[PDB]
Design an enzyme around this catalytic site. Structure first.
Site, mmCIF file in Angstrom:
data_model
loop_
_atom_site.group_PDB
_atom_site.id
_atom_site.type_symbol
_atom_site.label_atom_id
_atom_site.label_comp_id
_atom_site.label_asym_id
_atom_site.label_seq_id
_atom_site.Cartn_x
_atom_site.Cartn_y
_atom_site.Cartn_z
ATOM 1 N N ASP A 132 56.784 29.847 36.212
ATOM 2 C CA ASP A 132 56.957 30.762 35.204
ATOM 3 C C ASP A 132 58.464 30.576 34.414
ATOM 4 O O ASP A 132 59.430 30.695 35.209
ATOM 5 C CB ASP A 132 57.250 32.020 36.185
ATOM 6 C CG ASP A 132 57.326 33.420 35.257
ATOM 7 O OD1 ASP A 132 56.711 33.118 34.143
ATOM 8 O OD2 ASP A 132 57.605 34.499 35.753
ATOM 9 N N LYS B 75 39.586 59.708 59.334
ATOM 10 C CA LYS B 75 39.131 58.203 59.642
ATOM 11 C C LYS B 75 40.224 57.840 60.488
ATOM 12 O O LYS B 75 40.142 57.093 61.628
ATOM 13 C CB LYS B 75 39.221 57.227 58.344
ATOM 14 C CG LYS B 75 38.011 57.862 57.327
ATOM 15 C CD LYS B 75 38.358 57.278 55.905
ATOM 16 C CE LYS B 75 36.717 56.596 55.457
ATOM 17 N NZ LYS B 75 35.750 57.533 55.464
ATOM 18 N N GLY C 147 52.990 29.303 43.811
ATOM 19 C CA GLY C 147 51.687 29.197 43.290
ATOM 20 C C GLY C 147 51.364 28.914 42.028
ATOM 21 O O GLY C 147 50.475 28.306 41.686
ATOM 22 N N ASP C 148 52.736 28.963 41.247
ATOM 23 C CA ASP C 148 52.588 28.679 39.775
ATOM 24 C C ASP C 148 53.926 28.608 39.302
ATOM 25 O O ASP C 148 55.083 28.725 39.760
ATOM 26 C CB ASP C 148 51.796 29.724 38.877
ATOM 27 C CG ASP C 148 52.718 31.119 39.141
ATOM 28 O OD1 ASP C 148 53.502 31.099 38.046
ATOM 29 O OD2 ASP C 148 52.496 31.872 39.864
ATOM 30 N N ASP D 3 53.033 29.948 32.798
ATOM 31 C CA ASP D 3 53.244 31.008 31.922
ATOM 32 C C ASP D 3 54.463 30.910 31.024
ATOM 33 O O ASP D 3 55.757 30.463 31.669
ATOM 34 C CB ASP D 3 53.182 32.666 32.257
ATOM 35 C CG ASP D 3 52.005 33.071 33.219
ATOM 36 O OD1 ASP D 3 50.971 31.838 33.012
ATOM 37 O OD2 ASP D 3 51.874 33.841 33.485
ATOM 38 N N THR E 276 35.462 36.928 42.841
ATOM 39 C CA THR E 276 36.924 37.224 42.470
ATOM 40 C C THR E 276 37.932 36.381 42.532
ATOM 41 O O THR E 276 38.810 36.831 42.230
ATOM 42 C CB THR E 276 37.041 38.699 43.187
ATOM 43 O OG1 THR E 276 36.744 39.911 42.117
ATOM 44 C CG2 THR E 276 38.377 38.855 43.821
ATOM 45 N N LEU F 174 51.952 64.437 55.619
ATOM 46 C CA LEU F 174 52.246 63.801 54.415
ATOM 47 C C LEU F 174 51.535 63.975 53.234
ATOM 48 O O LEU F 174 50.374 64.309 52.933
ATOM 49 C CB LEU F 174 52.119 62.178 54.647
ATOM 50 C CG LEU F 174 52.833 62.076 56.052
ATOM 51 C CD1 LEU F 174 52.901 60.441 56.420
ATOM 52 C CD2 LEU F 174 54.335 62.184 56.101
#
Ligand SMILES: [Cl-]
Ligand SMILES: [Cl-]
Ligand code: NA
Ligand code: NA
Length: 327
Positions: A184, A64, A181-182, A248, A93, A54
DNA sequence: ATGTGAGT
DNA sequence: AAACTCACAT
């Protein structure tokens, strides 16, 4: 597909270590593209060499893969899972406004928990302090019943300022999600097209009112076309406030509005299918426009749009309700 | 003017 | 995914 998940998961987790802790963006990128090319591979992979065929999969990654296929594990992963330097960077984070860069500095100084943070706000900026302050409320999902309540308040206020406005609550909510989640919002008005002036007031005016009526509590940013901030549903007394919610608001020129509403409704995979299916017919689609493609193979001049239906019409697809846009 | 950072 | 908007420091 659904047959090579173990390897891709391993890859996205390696991708994430590179961004957060190594801050080496090219390695992060290779890992991401290597993952996505493998997730669309038809066969169950049985070795590194097979995977290497690929494009985007090379020497190190194929190595790995050998290890993972033989041990079910990868030492590099296990090593860093034990190491607390990265578990910390990852936790910090989780605070809106804190990325890998701020994350590093804090843990070097010894700051590793929410309690640590709440004793060191002087090392934070505005946005980050609003993040720390509402870290829990934010990490909560939001019950659709509340959404329908928020929706009312904004649309209702909007019509009262100027009936010509158009405002549309997008996202998986629109699709019919049980929660989210929020919140918009996409906004437009007839005086605002991609060829006209540049009225910033149009957003500002709707943002202020919501603050006047105590619906918007805090601000993370606010410009001529985009707002990012905080709202909370109002309480009957003093007793129990609702959790603080993120919201937002985005202003869009009338000529581009519905490509907008389509984009920010998704699903992500729906957008994949549509953009796909809307290619073979001979068009291109995005956040902004739909164009027809050239015989040689090149787009030009946006077609006119004034509804969601218009886009389905062009690509000879039948309109599909938001409900049926999960896939 | 430019660069770094963060979020969608 | 990635292009775009805004914040902060220089
Ligand atoms: Cl790169
Ligand atoms: Cl600072
Ligand atoms: Na964050
Ligand atoms: Na949603």
């Amino acid at each position: 597909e659904t047959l090579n998940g173990g390897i891709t998961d391993m890859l996205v987790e390696l991708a994430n270590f590179e961004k957060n802790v190594s801050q080496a963006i090219h390695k992060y990128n290779a890992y991401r593209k290597a993952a996505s090319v493998i997730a669309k591979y038809p066969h169950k992979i049985k070795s590194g060499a097979e995977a290497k065929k690929l494009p985007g999969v090379g020497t190190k990654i194929a190595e790995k893969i050998d290890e993972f296929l033989a041990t079910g594990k990868l030492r590099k992963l296990e090593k860093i899972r034990q190491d607390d330097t990265s578990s910390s960077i990852n936790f910090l984070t989780r605070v809106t406004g804190i990325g890998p860069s701020a994350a590093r500095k804090l843990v070097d100084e010894g700051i590793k928990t929410l309690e640590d943070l709440r004793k060191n706000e002087d090392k934070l900026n505005h946005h980050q302090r609003i993040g720390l302050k509402y870290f829990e409320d934010f990490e909560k999902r939001i019950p659709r019943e509340e959404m329908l309540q928020m929706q009312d308040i904004v649309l209702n206020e909007v019509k009262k300022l100027d009936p010509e406005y158009i405002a549309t609550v997008c996202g998986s909510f629109r699709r019919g999600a049980e929660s989210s989640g929020d919140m918009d919002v996409l906004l437009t008005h007839p005086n605002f097209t991609s060829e006209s002036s540049k009225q910033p007031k149009l957003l500002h005016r709707v943002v202020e009112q919501l603050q006047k009526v105590r619906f918007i509590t805090d601000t993370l940013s606010k410009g001529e076309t985009k707002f990012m901030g905080v709202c909370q549903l109002p309480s009957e007394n003093d007793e129990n406030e609702y959790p603080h919610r993120r919201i937002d608001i985005r202003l869009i020129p009338k000529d581009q509005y519905y490509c907008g509403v389509l984009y920010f409704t998704g699903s992500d995979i729906f957008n994949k299918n549509m953009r796909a299916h809307a290619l073979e017919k001979g068009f291109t689609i995005n956040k902004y426009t739909i164009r027809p493609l050239g015989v040689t193979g090149v787009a030009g001049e946006p077609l006119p749009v004034d509804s969601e239906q218009d886009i389905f019409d062009y690509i000879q697809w039948r309109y599909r309700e938001p409900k049926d846009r999960s896939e």
